């Protein structure tokens, strides 16, 4: 079945580094250079064997035709009001990018306001971030090219959608916040650097600053408002309070949910914004999260996890700011995570909880924190919402495994609230009633109970005969909640698959303690939880090891790669997208220094000893047992992935092919695909998304010999 030869890849046997006394060889270190002829030649050599492997089977074209048919459904965001006008995003089904529309009212005709599809021939220029002026009359928007995290911020006057001269460069991980006087906007930029800044470089990003751009001026005139030259990893994002009076500055360092909170009372600036602001350092440590909700005069409401791993709402009065004086507006729940909170219609709060990995949505009184209204949802996720302090209505969008969006609307000026379906879409093609979603909790190695969702056709026999696609992430306090994926439903319907999503530790499903039980010294908990989910699916007869595929992206690509190394007997197929594979060196490149809050950093001997045991690059090993080989493996990455630089996947595949691929017992393929004009995933055009899932499922179908079910 393997009609190709792995390319010959030079090993630099002199690349030896001492970590705390332990010598580590890195013979493919030269792949760290994205611009060398050698690296480009390796990528071309790998794509040359991967592409014909994936395309050779007719199943890919059947999958792509079906994905193109079933993904072609209208997709909408919530409506949102800005000034006198409503806006929403909309895709007729297959456009590369969704289009921003504007209307003068809800019953009014809609016009195209911003169509990113016209900015490139191939849909690889995407909107990334935007901010309307407080009165809704002006509009700032970030554009990214080829999926790079780099952004150019541009500006428009809303009435007539008139392009303005203002352009801001060197923007990345940036806030966008206009002052309420309409004069100009806060944003973040990084200093000049040598070499490229287009997403193909690996250069570390440090010394991010906060600037204020005055509309109608050149970027060279912008005001430096905050900088941390003795703390190069600090990132300070600005936002205005709802009354326009205070700039709040959230300073982060790494990815934990914590921040400093400094404020500037703009009434106390003698001369407007002319230099470094008069910051009051309200919270001047990284012990807790303080996420601004609203304020009334000097009484600020924040969502926090300060001594509340499931999060709660507190009121901090700037004129009586000592911690013993804070008021607890909505106390922490014993188990449910308060995920986010919005203030709407002056004195309402909308609170979204996660209860056993499903959202609930509640309305509360701002003054007392009392529950006023439950917004009833089916089982799934709230994935979009609109409703700010000045608005008198909300919209929110619900999704699940089996249903594409429902958008709800509620007019909050009414004495008796009636939330109503505002928009619902139906995918013709899949009968949702043919499938079920179950949630179960399975004991991990240490006995901890882990949630997992399983989606399958009703009536199946649990005789172990079904291919399965098990997904995990496990990290960064990210919760993996139900979402509609027509790509995965094609696997169910047309490949007879079972889908599974394991809510392993490292995620935020059960708050900061869930997150803590899968980071740093406990990172191996994520892997053990994920391997246990696989053994549960096998033991319960959903699938068998040879029919089981696992998949994860980024930190989830680290998850599945490490699982391939640790339990190659457990999986038939592994797809790792944009994975972090070199755990010893991740912190050196672009923004990777920020991940040491989850992983640790190999500069410390203690952290090094955790990382070396699971780092995918350093744990490739031929299974000892004569009858065990590695699963079939496919790594997917792209040449502008400046979030997780692609050298991770390049070095990993070189190593798989050399150590495992060369052996006689290995007959499962070990392949990489590197895409062009794309990056970590955000803003990827629909045409590339379709190509990507087509590759994944053709790899699966070919590797497991799965028949298409028309």
């Amino acid at each position: 079945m393997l009609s190709f030869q792995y390319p010959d890849v030079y090993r630099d046997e002199t690349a030896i580094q001492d970590y705390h006394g332990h010598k580590v060889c890195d013979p493919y270190a030269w792949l760290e250079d994205p611009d060398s002829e050698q690296t480009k030649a390796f990528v071309e050599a790998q794509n040359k064997i991967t592409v014909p492997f994936l395309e050779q089977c007719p199943i890919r074209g059947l999958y792509k035709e079906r994905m193109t048919e079933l993904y072609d459904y209208p997709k909408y965001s919530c409506h949102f009001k800005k000034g006198k006008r409503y806006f929403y995003f909309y895709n007729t089904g297959l456009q590369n990018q969704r289009v921003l529309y504007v209307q003068d009212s809800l019953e009014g005709e809609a016009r195209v306001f911003l169509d990113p599809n016209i900015l490139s021939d191939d849909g690889t220029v995407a909107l990334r971030g935007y901010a309307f002026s407080e009165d809704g009359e002006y509009f700032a928007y970030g554009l990214s090219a080829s999926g790079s995290d780099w952004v150019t911020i541009k500006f428009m006057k809303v009435d007539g959608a008139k392009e303005l001269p203002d352009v801001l460069e060197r923007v990345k991980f940036s806030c966008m916040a206009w002052t309420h006087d309409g004069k100009g906007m806060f944003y973040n930029a990084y200093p000049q650097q040598d070499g490229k800044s287009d997403g193909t470089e690996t250069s570390t990003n440090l010394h991010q600053k906060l600037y204020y751009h005055v509309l109608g001026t050149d970027q060279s005139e912008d005001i430096l408002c905050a900088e941390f030259p003795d703390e190069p990893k600090w990132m300070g994002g600005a936002e205005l309070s709802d009354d326009g009076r205070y700039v709040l500055l959230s300073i982060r360092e790494g990815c934990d949910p914590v921040n400093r909170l400094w404020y500037c009372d703009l009434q106390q600036e003698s001369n407007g914004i002319t230099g470094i602001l008069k910051w009051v350092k309200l919270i001047d440590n990284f012990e807790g999260e303080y996420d601004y909700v609203t304020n009334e005069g000097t009484v600020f409401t924040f969502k926090t996890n300060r001594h509340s791993p499931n999060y709660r709402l507190i009121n901090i009065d700037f004129t009586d700011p000592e911690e013993s004086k804070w008021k607890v507006l909505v106390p922490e729940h014993e188990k449910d995570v308060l995920e986010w909170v919005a203030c709407v219609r002056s004195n309402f709060l909308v609170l979204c909880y996660l209860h056993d990995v499903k959202n609930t949505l509640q309305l509360h009184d701002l003054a007392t924190g009392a529950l006023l209204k439950i917004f009833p949802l089916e089982v799934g996720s709230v994935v979009g919402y609109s409703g700010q302090k000045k608005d008198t209505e909300i919209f929110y969008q619900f999704t699940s495994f089996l249903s594409p969006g429902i958008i709800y609307h509620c007019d909050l000026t009414k004495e008796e609230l009636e939330p109503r379906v505002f928009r619902e879409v139906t995918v013709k093609g899949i009968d949702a009633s043919d499938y079920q979603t179950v949630q179960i909790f399975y004991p991990s190695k240490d006995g901890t109970k882990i949630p997992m969702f399983i989606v399958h056709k009703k009536g199946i026999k649990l005789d172990g005969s079904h291919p399965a696609f098990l997904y995990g992430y496990g990290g960064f306090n990210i919760s993996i909640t139900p979402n509609y994926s027509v790509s995965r439903l094609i696997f169910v319907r047309h490949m007879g698959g079972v889908l599974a999503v394991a809510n392993i530790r490292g995620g935020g499903e059960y708050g900061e303690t869930w997150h803590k039980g899968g980071i740093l010294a406990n990172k191996q908990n994520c892997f053990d939880d994920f391997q246990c989910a696989a053994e549960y699916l096998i033991k319960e007869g959903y699938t068998s090891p040879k029919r089981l595929t696992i998949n994860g992206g980024a930190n989830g690509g680290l998850l599945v790669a490490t699982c391939a190394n640790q339990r190659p007997d457990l999986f038939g197929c592994v797809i790792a997208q944009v994975g972090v594979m070199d755990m010893l060196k991740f912190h050196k490149y672009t923004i990777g220094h920020a991940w040491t809050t989850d992983y640790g950093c190999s500069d410390s001997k203690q952290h090094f000893e955790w990382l070396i045991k699971y780092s995918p690059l350093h744990n490739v090993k031929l299974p000892e047992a004569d009858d065990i080989q590695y699963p079939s493996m496919l790594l997917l990455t792209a040449d502008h992935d400046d979030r997780v630089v692609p050298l991770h996947s390049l070095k990993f595949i070189a190593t798989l092919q050399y150590i495992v691929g060369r052996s006689r017992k290995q007959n499962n393929p070990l392949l990489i695909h590197v895409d062009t004009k794309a990056g970590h995933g955000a803003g990827k055009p629909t045409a590339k998304v379709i190509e990507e899932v087509s590759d994944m499922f053709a790899f699966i179908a070919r590797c497991l010999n799965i028949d298409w079910i028309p």
């Binding site: 995290d149 990132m235 990815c255 960064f476 990210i478 980024a554 991740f586 923004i591 920020a594 991940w595």
Partner: peptide, 4 residues
Amino acid sequence: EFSP
């Protein structure tokens, strides 16, 4: 967001 700048998580992996």
